[PDB]
Design a protein around this nucleic acid. Structure first.
Lengths: 44, 65, 93, 100
RNA sequence: AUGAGUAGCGAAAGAGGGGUGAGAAUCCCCUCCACCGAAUGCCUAAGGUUUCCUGAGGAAGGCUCGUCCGCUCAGGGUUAGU
RNA sequence: GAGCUGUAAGCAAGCUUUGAUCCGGAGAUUUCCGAAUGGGGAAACCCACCACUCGUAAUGGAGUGGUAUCCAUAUCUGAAUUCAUAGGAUAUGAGAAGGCAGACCCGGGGAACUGAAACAUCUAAGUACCCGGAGGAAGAGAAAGCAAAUGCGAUUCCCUGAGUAGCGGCGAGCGAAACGGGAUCAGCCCAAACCAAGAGGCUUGCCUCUUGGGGUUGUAGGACACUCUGUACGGAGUUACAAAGGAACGAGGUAGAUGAAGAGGUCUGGAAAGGCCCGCCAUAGGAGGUAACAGCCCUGUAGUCAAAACUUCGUUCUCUCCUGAGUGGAUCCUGAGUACGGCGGAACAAUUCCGUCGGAAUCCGGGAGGACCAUCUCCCAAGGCUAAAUACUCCCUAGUGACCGAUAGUGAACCAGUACCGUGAGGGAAAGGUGAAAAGCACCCCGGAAGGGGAGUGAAAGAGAUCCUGAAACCGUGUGCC
């Protein structure tokens, strides 16, 4: 029950994906900021 | 059944009741799909009964340890 | 699975299903995490028949709408059980 | 302060001065259905129930603060009180002291 | 609001008979005619994500129309040891 | 304590005074991802091993637990080295791993624009920002002090000193402290030197290893030697004051209960809470609602109460623990590469920081009062622990505005960080109002429908679904004069 964008582009997920965001302190900062704003969608 | 009664039966005896109730639910669901169920309230009633039984069982096992 | 009655959810009653039922094939809605052998054994136990083959599909959810709001329906798992020359699951349809 | 099956009397509205019997209660809205009071005429289309259809004549709920119970011994309107008779709380009539 | 009922509405071949229908240039059927054919044919990728089938529909949308649609709404439909 | 199955319709089927729905305390269940931790991975998914169980003649299948890394404690073994040791293995670990409150506070690093009308320092500014650590508060803390007195005596915060001294291309600007007035108010423990016990080198002695007594000090104290005084019926305490569990009473918090008095008459009206003529209650004239403006209609308010269960505080009992004061001053102690000096940068006689070398004294002893040299005055460094007064609020409860009232007030009064835009970090809207009550238009007529005209409901239908009021631009129909 969601919306998916390019569910086959692997490079999209390897650049802007959740596991790449969680692999460095700066990406975790990005995720923290987006959680603070209240975004419905975190990362790709 | 009310908890009081369920609490009187032996653990094994409870397990059996649960088995039986689960069969009733299976049948009830199949009847609904075909189109031969009138008391649809029976479905919900059975589900809650199964829960009441499992609650009593766990409470006895926690008490043990 | 723990109790086989958790593998089978409800039968499927359509025109295609009624067509297949005359070839001794029955269509069920199945828990989305159950596999072929699980369904085979559950049908064995519940109805006391002999099972020859099982085939399974996966179905995506459909987009629906009621007024202004939009959503999706649940995913489904469908199984077509082919019985051998044995008894007949009475679905009492 | 009043419930289903009570003899009440309407105090305010078009039907002020009428008296009847409670038929239903809606505590979620503080409204109440009194018989013979606040009659409406609904224009109902033909459908499965009432196949021919027509113009009905039913009651409509009034606000519960527009109505007050009747004192059993005098018959006049009374305010409500609450006593505990036998390990059971009972609505009392302030004007006299009788129950309900 | 004005410009203004103005500019647009692009190739490229259609014509008639019948039907449906409140309504037909435009939808369906028939007949003839015409166009592509190292494709404008067959299959099958990437990609899209129900757009597929049946019934209903005439708000909106479809550079005109519409009884039609990739549009709307209800049901359905995807089966592998190779 | 009588209805109920959320929004929220409908349409079925049911539950409930042998007491439901609902509210509060305590529990149970809690799929998958996520620090994610069996391995892998494009987060929401794949693929395993071990033990036990279900099932098959057996293979195949299923269920329940365990299986990351680091650290600590051990236990063994034990690469180099034989032991040892790196390590390995084994165990025991509610250990730690991540999040956040865009706030408050400790530590480290650390801009530029700007201004100085230019620019030379400076200012901006130890600000923004980044990194690490936390706690409900946090470093701060009981004088080798202020200072010059008739001295005060820990720390922190507010007023004043004062925009003064001072520093400043002494220009912009930066900018103190002490005294005095207040808030809060307690100070302690160790090391050292001595006594007793065991061992471990040494030959007994000796001498260190440990454990118990000992003792916390500067107009010096302690040790030490000798006196009284005690080991309780007294004192103290888990908030520092070494350390350390329960039990009873009281007040709260997390549901609630009770709770006075008008249908007054009469007028308008769709409806009376309004007008007029009368009464009542008040420890209650807060507030909201009800067909219009209610103290007396409802929910309520003042005042009284109330808790099975969790919690927050107090008080008492219980519990636990515990000597001080003298005379001396023969002999020992009072905090080691430190106090201070050089050597460089750092910083900037110079000043300090850090390194870079050095290097005392120690009661008849030291350190200070801008330097040095002497007088006098205060203090006792190189060990540790301490509440309160202060800072801030993501949250919860009760309230309050000469605060806004739908272009305002939060970006967001409405399914808003949504819809949309972007590859991404990120950017970021519009949109409230029928009626008291759906009573939300049966039926007739034109029309395929939409939409109308009657009929009906209603106080109102010109209140009929973007349905309160409804201005202007803009668009039309009729007409008096030209």
């Amino acid at each position: 029950m969601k919306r998916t964008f390019q569910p086959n582009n692997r490079k999209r997920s390897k650049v802007h994906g959740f596991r790449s965001r969680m692999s460095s302190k700066n990406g975790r900062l990005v995720l923290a900021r987006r959680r603070r704003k209240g975004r419905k969608v975190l990362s790709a | 059944m009310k908890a009081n009664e369920i609490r009187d039966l032996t653990t094994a005896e409870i397990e059996q009741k649960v088995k039986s109730l689960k069969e009733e639910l299976f049948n009830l669901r199949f009847q609904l799909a075909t189109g031969q169920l009138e008391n649809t309230a029976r479905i919900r009633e059975v589900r809650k009964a199964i829960a009441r039984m499992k609650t009593v069982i766990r409470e006895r096992e926690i008490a043990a340890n | 699975m723990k109790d086989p009655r958790d593998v089978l959810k409800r039968p499927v009653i359509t025109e295609r299903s009624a067509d297949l039922m005359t070839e001794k094939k029955y269509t069920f809605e199945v828990d989305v995490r159950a596999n072929k052998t699980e369904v085979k054994d559950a049908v064995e136990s519940i109805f006391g028949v002999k099972v020859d083959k099982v085939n399974i599909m996966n179905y995506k959810g459909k987009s629906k709408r009621v007024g202004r709001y939009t959503g999706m329906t649940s995913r489904r798992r469908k199984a077509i059980v082919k019985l051998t020359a044995d008894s007949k699951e009475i679905e009492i349809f | 302060h009043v419930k289903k099956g009570d003899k009440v009397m309407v105090i305010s509205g078009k039907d002020k001065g009428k008296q009847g019997t409670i038929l239903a209660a809606f505590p979620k809205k503080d409204r109440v259905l009194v018989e013979g009071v606040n009659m409406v005429k609904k224009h109902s289309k033909p459908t499965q129930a009432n196949p021919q259809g027509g113009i009905s004549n039913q009651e409509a709920p009034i606000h519960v603060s527009n109505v007050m119970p009747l004192d059993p011994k005098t018959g006049e309107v009374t305010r409500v009180g609450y006593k505990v008779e036998d390990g059971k709380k009972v609505r009392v009539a302030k004007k006299s002291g009788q129950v309900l």
